[PDB]
Amino acid sequence: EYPTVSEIPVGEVRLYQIADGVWSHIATQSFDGAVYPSNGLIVRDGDELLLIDTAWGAKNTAALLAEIEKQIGLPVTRAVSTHFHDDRVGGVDVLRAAGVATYASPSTRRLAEVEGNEIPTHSLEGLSSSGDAVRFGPVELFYPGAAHSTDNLVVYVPSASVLYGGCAIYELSRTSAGNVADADLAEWPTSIERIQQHYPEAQFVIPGHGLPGGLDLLKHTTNVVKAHTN
Ligand SMILES: O=S(=O)(NCc1n[nH]nc1CNC1CCCCC1)c1cc(Cl)ccc1Cl
Ligand SMILES: [O-]
Ligand SMILES: [Zn+2]
Ligand SMILES: [Zn+2]
């Protein structure tokens, strides 16, 4: 039932219902000779929608907006990017042109600029130090510390017990880190420990790439990261 990489042509976007008023979006993109799936989140925000992460590119993000209109039918008014990589910010220009106010931490915005990526318009305050949390409409934004990247955020939807871990959390079948370029492998386990302490009632845990799971994904990710470290 959760769509997989070989089921989604590049340029198409699927939506998956996680709970009332909470969906993931799933897209695919070609990178370095392979095609990968990627997830984000959509959360009902009253009569509007909050988007977490782009669909990894301008064309995909346009398809995301079209699918949202067709399937959900409320406007996206705000978006948050959970770190600076193109799977998170690529498509912010389409979002802005569609009327969406785009947000990221000050660090994410600076990192995206230096990388040559699109830059969310607005800075999120109150997220500069590990352990910082802020409310943003129907979600809590949390900076757990460096992990997959120095700037990575996670997102919790309290009304639904959904934790969106983004690229800091691996799907269960994933047994290797792949590219660790921008990661802080020494810090990552401690960042995950912060997440576990802050969100012990999470029921659904959504990774940045691959299948949803539960809080088991936290220990799993720690195991993979430590194994690479050695
Ligand atoms: O090489 S990977 O196996 N591991 C690194 C990784 N972990 N989490 N996200 C990423 C990819 N990050 C990038 C950075 C630059 C632009 C696009 C995405 C991978 C590679 C791809 Cl391109 C998408 C999925 C995976 Cl899972
Ligand atoms: O990423
Ligand atoms: Zn990344
Ligand atoms: Zn990623």
CB 159 within 8 A of CB 141: no
Confirm or reject: Cβ of 209 under 6 Å from ligand 1: yes
The 3-state secondary structure of the chain, one letter per residue:
CCCCHHHCCCCCCEEEEEECCEEEEEEEEEECCEEEEEEEEEEEECCEEEEECCCCCHHHHHHHHHHHHHHCCCCEEEEECCCCCHHHHCCHHHHHHCCCEEEECHHHHHHHHHHCCCCCCEECCCCCCCCCEEEECCEEEECCCCCCCCCCCEEEECCCCEEEEECCCCCCCCCCCCCCCCCCCCCHHHHHHHHHHHCCCCCEEEECCCCCECCHHHHHHHHHHHHHHC
Quote the CA–CA distance of 81 and 88 in Å, as a whole number: 5
Confirm or reject: Cβ of 85 under 6 Å from ligand 2: yes
What six digits make up the tokens of 167?
């690229």
DSSP-assigned beta bridge partners for residue 34: 31
Method: X-ray
Q: Is 25 a catalytic residue?
A: no
Cα distances from 68 to residues 62, 71, 206, in angstroms, run 10, 5, 19
Report CA torsion sign: 22, 28, 31, 35.
positive
Give 167 Cα–ligand 3 centroid separation in angstroms: 6
Closest C-alpha among 152, 96, 148 to residue 119: 96
176 Cα nearest atom in ligand 1 = 3
Confirm or reject: Cβ of 36 under 6 Å from ligand 1: yes
Q: How many CB atoms lie within 10 A of CB 229?
A: 12
Report resolution (Å) to 1 decimal: 1.1
Confirm or reject: Cβ of 53 under 6 Å from ligand 1: no
Q: How many CB atoms lie within 10 A of CB 3?
A: 18
Q: Is 148 a catalytic residue?
A: yes
Quote the CA–CA distance of 123 and 175 in Å, as a whole number: 35
Give 47 Cα–ligand 1 centroid separation in angstroms: 34
